[PDB]
Amino acid sequence: GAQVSSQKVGAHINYTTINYYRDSASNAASKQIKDVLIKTAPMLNSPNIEACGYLQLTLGNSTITTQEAANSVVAYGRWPEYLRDVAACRFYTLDTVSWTKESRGWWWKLPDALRDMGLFGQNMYYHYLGRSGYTVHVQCNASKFHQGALGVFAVPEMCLAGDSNTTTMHTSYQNANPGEKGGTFTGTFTPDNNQTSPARRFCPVDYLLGNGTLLGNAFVFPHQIINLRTNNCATLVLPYVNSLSIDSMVKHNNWGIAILPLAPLNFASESSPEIPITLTIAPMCCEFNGLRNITLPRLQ
Amino acid sequence: GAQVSSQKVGAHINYTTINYYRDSASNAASKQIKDVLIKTAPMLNSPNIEACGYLQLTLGNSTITTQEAANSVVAYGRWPEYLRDVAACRFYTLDTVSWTKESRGWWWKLPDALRDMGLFGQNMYYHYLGRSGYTVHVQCNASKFHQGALGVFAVPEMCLAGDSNTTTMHTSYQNANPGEKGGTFTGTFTPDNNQTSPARRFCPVDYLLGNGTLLGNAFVFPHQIINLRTNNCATLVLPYVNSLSIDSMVKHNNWGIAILPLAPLNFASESSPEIPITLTIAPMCCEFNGLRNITLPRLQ
Amino acid sequence: RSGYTVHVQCNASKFHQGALGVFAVPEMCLAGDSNTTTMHTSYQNANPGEKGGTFTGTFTPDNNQTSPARRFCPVDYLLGNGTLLGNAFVFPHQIINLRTNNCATLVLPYVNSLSIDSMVKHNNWGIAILPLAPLNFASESSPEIPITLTIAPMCCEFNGLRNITLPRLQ
Amino acid sequence: IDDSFTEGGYISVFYQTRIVVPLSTPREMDILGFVSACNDFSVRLLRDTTHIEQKALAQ
Amino acid sequence: QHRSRSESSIESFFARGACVTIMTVDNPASTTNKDKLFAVWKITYKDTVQLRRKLEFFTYSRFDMELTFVVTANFTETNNGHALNQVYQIMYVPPGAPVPEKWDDYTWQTSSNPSIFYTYGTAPARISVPYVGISNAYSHFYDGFSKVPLKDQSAALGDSLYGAASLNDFGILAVRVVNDHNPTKVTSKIRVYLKPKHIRVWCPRPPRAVAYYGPGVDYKDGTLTPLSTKDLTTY
Amino acid sequence: QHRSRSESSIESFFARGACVTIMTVDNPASTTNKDKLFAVWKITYKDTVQLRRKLEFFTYSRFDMELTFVVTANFTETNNGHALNQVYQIMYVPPGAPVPEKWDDYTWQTSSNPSIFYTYGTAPARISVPYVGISNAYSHFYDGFSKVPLKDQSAALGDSLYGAASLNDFGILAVRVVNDHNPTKVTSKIRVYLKPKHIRVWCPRPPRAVAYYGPGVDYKDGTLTPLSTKDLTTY
Numbered sequence A, B: 001g002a003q004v005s006s007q008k009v010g011a012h013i014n015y016t017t018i019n020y021y022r023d024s025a026s027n028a029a030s031k032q033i034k035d036v037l038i039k040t041a042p043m044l045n046s047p048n049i050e051a052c053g054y055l056q057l058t059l060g061n062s063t064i065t066t067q068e069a070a071n072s073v074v075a076y077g078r079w080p081e082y083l084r085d086v087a088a089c090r091f092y093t094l095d096t097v098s099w100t101k102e103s104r105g106w107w108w109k110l111p112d113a114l115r116d117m118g119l120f121g122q123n124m125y126y127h128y129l130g131r132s133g134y135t136v137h138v139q140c141n142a143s144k145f146h147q148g149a150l151g152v153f154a155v156p157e158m159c160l161a162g163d164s165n166t167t168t169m170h171t172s173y174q175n176a177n178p179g180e181k182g183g184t185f186t187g188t189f190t191p192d193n194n195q196t197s198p199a200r201r202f203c204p205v206d207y208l209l210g211n212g213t214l215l216g217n218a219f220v221f222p223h224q225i226i227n228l229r230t231n232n233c234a235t236l237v238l239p240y241v242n243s244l245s246i247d248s249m250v251k252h253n254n255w256g257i258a259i260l261p262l263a264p265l266n267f268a269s270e271s272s273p274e275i276p277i278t279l280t281i282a283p284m285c286c287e288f289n290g291l292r293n294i295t296l297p298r299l300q
Numbered sequence C: 001r002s003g004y005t006v007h008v009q010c011n012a013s014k015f016h017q018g019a020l021g022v023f024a025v026p027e028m029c030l031a032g033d034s035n036t037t038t039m040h041t042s043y044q045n046a047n048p049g050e051k052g053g054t055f056t057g058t059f060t061p062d063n064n065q066t067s068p069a070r071r072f073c074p075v076d077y078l079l080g081n082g083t084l085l086g087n088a089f090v091f092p093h094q095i096i097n098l099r100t101n102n103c104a105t106l107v108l109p110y111v112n113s114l115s116i117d118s119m120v121k122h123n124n125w126g127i128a129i130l131p132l133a134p135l136n137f138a139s140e141s142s143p144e145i146p147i148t149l150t151i152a153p154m155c156c157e158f159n160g161l162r163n164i165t166l167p168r169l170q
Numbered sequence D: 001i002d003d004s005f006t007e008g009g010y011i012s013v014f015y016q017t018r019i020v021v022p023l024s025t026p027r028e029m030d031i032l033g034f035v036s037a038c039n040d041f042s043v044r045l046l047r048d049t050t051h052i053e054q055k056a057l058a059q
Numbered sequence E, F: 001q002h003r004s005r006s007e008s009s010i011e012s013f014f015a016r017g018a019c020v021t022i023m024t025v026d027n028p029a030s031t032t033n034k035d036k037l038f039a040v041w042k043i044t045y046k047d048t049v050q051l052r053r054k055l056e057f058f059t060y061s062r063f064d065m066e067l068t069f070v071v072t073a074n075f076t077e078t079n080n081g082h083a084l085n086q087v088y089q090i091m092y093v094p095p096g097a098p099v100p101e102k103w104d105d106y107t108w109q110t111s112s113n114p115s116i117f118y119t120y121g122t123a124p125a126r127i128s129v130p131y132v133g134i135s136n137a138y139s140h141f142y143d144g145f146s147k148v149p150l151k152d153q154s155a156a157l158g159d160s161l162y163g164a165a166s167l168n169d170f171g172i173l174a175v176r177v178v179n180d181h182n183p184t185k186v187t188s189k190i191r192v193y194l195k196p197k198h199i200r201v202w203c204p205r206p207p208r209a210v211a212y213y214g215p216g217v218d219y220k221d222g223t224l225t226p227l228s229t230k231d232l233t234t235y
């Protein structure tokens, strides 16, 4: 059973191997042009609804009307799919937010943001387990005389940093889960000094993506940019991502949506402009499991 | 994959080997008439333009008229060649020097000596990278009643010793690079004792080839001899030699030309004779790369 | 000898207006400043280098007899050469209309009565840029916009190498 | 590491013409810039980084 | 000719043993009023910073694991007396099993738990562990909670730590000097080096830019300004 | 019959381990006002003379390399007390990586750097290194400069050493006694033996005839007269 193979050589002969043990774990580590501009691993680079082979975007009775599409991205090059081997899952439009010359950014979590959306939300709380992918459609228009740029980031397991410097990992379930409402980024860290009666919530610094890493590198995550000059909307198609095939939607949030001003909003000459950002999100290829009496969370 | 082979024996049976590791570096060391006068490795012995299969010597508009040729040598048996897988490069004649009954010797460096030669020099300073081979033609005639012998040596990476005994490797760029002018050898080491304001230059002792090795052995280097009795000129064909395919011509000098009196100049009976030595050099198979704004060195 | 690619760059806004006439003239001999003597523009003055050289709306005769200016006096409507600007279009040209485009590209061949010539003594092509329609903006009494020229020599070749020419350009 | 022997050169940006805007529009604006490696790219000799540390550590 | 990307493959990148912890034990004079010291370490990659930062380039990982143990000992007091060669017992106590309360006790019988008996002065000890995760992959980040707060039940019961799954993921390493109390005291240290073999990684992330502050993603005031000053138009 | 030239082949000529350096470390009593000594050596073949002279027969070379480590220790003071067996850590710090400032610090975690943990009294340690040059061959001589002096910029900035390429070619070896401070002190020494394997050499040179004087080709006054007296007509 001796295994002979080519040695790791320079560029101007081989070695032999025998496995002594029954468990593979015991085994030694087995070590494995024209156009430079081309990506080695495209999918890791944020492809388009176009770029993997896949306008009126429609789910159930809900439907987006979109010319914008080169502005879309399929996370990790992977399209949503059923746990293999429903019109509760449709497009829900969340409460519109306002972008101003001084906004630092906004965040949301999935499924959390959708927890009260019609039959979807119901299905979520009546079952132990649930899984779902998403289509995130960020809407934000302005004039040809306005300027600015939004960075729309979809982060897997988006754990955010807390307000305390005396204790760690202590943000309350209530605070961690804002629902549709949102949750927002800040320009500076402000430690919750109230010892006795703790705020127990996140303190997300913008240039650190609220998680201890530099915002400039947030682009290694599935993302899209809204440049007011060229486009008014972004569409992110998100797959179910997890260390499990299915999980508790109530205990665990799979994806995080982060929206930050890469370039600040500016208009004509007004000292203080504003424009709306509307998020319409739809759950995809979704399925639930382990039906029983309804979960009634202490959200407060 | 066991490898069986003949043992290193006397002269009146073998051993076995197996490679245990993936990287060749880990491998053990693998150990590999009629006329005595013949050289085992000729190329290491300074061949002729003749001796490897290769008079009017001409490059671009420049041209040497030579009978002398058995007096030529192709360094390391290797002819100049293009970096594989131009009439700026022609014959330039440098300032003539004078050989006297008391000269100890002369040195030059390439490309340095050619740094101001027409379009060659320009090309050198407008590019990051450049490579070139050379044809060095040493000219020195006398009468049938004169006598003497010049040793013409072409040294690869000809690092020369400095003037200081308090500090090392300290010769200034300016001093190390004389340009066409030259640079000269000395009979004795004279330590630059001026501590506070250092001369920062070479002190090349003749019998030590200016580098700590004995002149008598300088012949292991590509060379040629001008014996006034038999010939008045020498021609050395130099290949691009380096640890790299191409390099910075401004930072690094590839070849060194050393000319030393093996046998002292003597004439008829004059207590103090003189004869001229003229160097004509041409860059060969030459090429440049990485064009940008011009390098303006602080040569002083 | 050499050919050229002339790339004229000039952008403005959708509220600006104007039109540039970019003309490539073969053997573009220009008229001089003198009315007492002819064909007398100095080599130095005739050859401005990169700097340029400019057109004028009116002919102003160099009257300084004793110490002559010895330079060109190029009247715009006469293409600086005694011919009417309106007809300059019989020459290889292109128009930059601020409304429709911000740049022009002219690919010029080597043109001459010879296969090759002295680049130092003789200029083959002349580039003339004139406002066919005047620059105007929104309402500013006095606007401005930049014109940048990027030029590349083409299929080019040289001959008769020797010591360098050091001209008395001044 | 910064080392003269293996220096790589200079990237610089300039105004070719100039930025031009109409009235009623912002005269100042921002550009963002990005870098990445091309597919001809590679690295060698794995090593520890200085970009993080435990100074307080004790190993 | 042609450059290879082999040394930057995910295996090659992690193909090194890294110190994940230092355990301290001892063997005192029997007389002593204070107890014989045995070590109890909770297995994790987060007590040290370097392997952690490298793993955190990724959200999820899957790998067989190799642990190597470097043991060193030394004398505590001026004493001048000596000690015979020490034998160490490295017991793995999986979540659920009886944790030792004394260098002495029955838990060290180790009938079902894996133990390593190491002899001082010999080649560093070494074992391999399979991918032991209860999920399809090890999770480097968990944006969620262990348990959900029910409106009904009381506030305290429904509570749990952010970003944490099981109170006990991988159990613990218990270490002791098997030798009996010695007149003159010796203190020893066990260094645990960890190397991931046969590894796979998913969902990439930006490297940690600011000092770690506990097991989570949290950061500390005054450590938030990593970047250096350098002017825009200066090479 | 017939003589072979095998033992004078370039491999056979260098087929020997040569001392390239001696590193000194120690492990002192914790009490001590002075710091615990750890070694930091900058890798080179030029600190000793013999391997250097042999390599310098050639201008350029290319070879895989084998390093072997001989470790010896001893007692410093009259003391009469003792120490348990020492374990040494030989860390390779490549150009760029954090250099250790203390026997103690985080750099020794060695997550990505190669380290050798050596046990005193055991067969001398040994590893192999590939040809790690950034050029196509190791350069034994560089007639040039690290950087060119620009007329424009100031004189000081444009300056550099003659014959030197990178301020840091191959990085450094950092060595320490892993064991904790011991009441009675022990001093140790590490001898590094170097052997070039799988070697190729180009462009031959005459051997060094006069005493070496630093890393360069420089020579010292008073060492310049190697040759002996012997009269012309005397056998």
Ligand SMILES: CCCCCCCCCCCCC/C=C/[C@@H](O)[C@H](N)CO
Pocket: E043, E044, E045, E065, E067, E090, E091, E092, E114, E115, E116, E127, E129, E132, E137, E138, E139, E140, E169, E170
């Ligand atoms: C005799 C010694 C036996 C040692 C047995 C060790 C078994 C336990 C191995 C746990 C390996 C944990 C590696 C990191 C896991 C974590 O990423 C996470 N928090 C993932 O869910």
Ligand SMILES: CCCCCCCCCCCCC/C=C/[C@@H](O)[C@H](N)CO
Pocket: F043, F044, F045, F065, F067, F090, F091, F092, F114, F115, F116, F127, F129, F132, F137, F138, F139, F140, F169, F170
């Ligand atoms: C755990 C121990 C690892 C030791 C790793 C050693 C790696 C560094 C090897 C450098 C070998 C240098 C050999 C001589 C090189 C020099 O000739 C030159 N100055 C050539 O450019």
Ligand SMILES: *C(=O)CCCCCCCCCCCCC
Pocket: A001, A002, A018, A019, A020, A021
């Ligand atoms: C395939 O493996 C058959 C050839 C095996 C060569 C025999 C020698 C191997 C010795 C080790 C086997 C025992 C290790 C558990």
Ligand SMILES: *C(=O)CCCCCCCCCCCCC
Pocket: A002, A004, A016, A017, A018, B001, B002, B018, B019, B020, B021
């Ligand atoms: C070719 O090598 C096949 C014959 C091999 C003989 C088997 C015994 C070799 C034992 C060593 C192999 C393990 C070393 C990594």
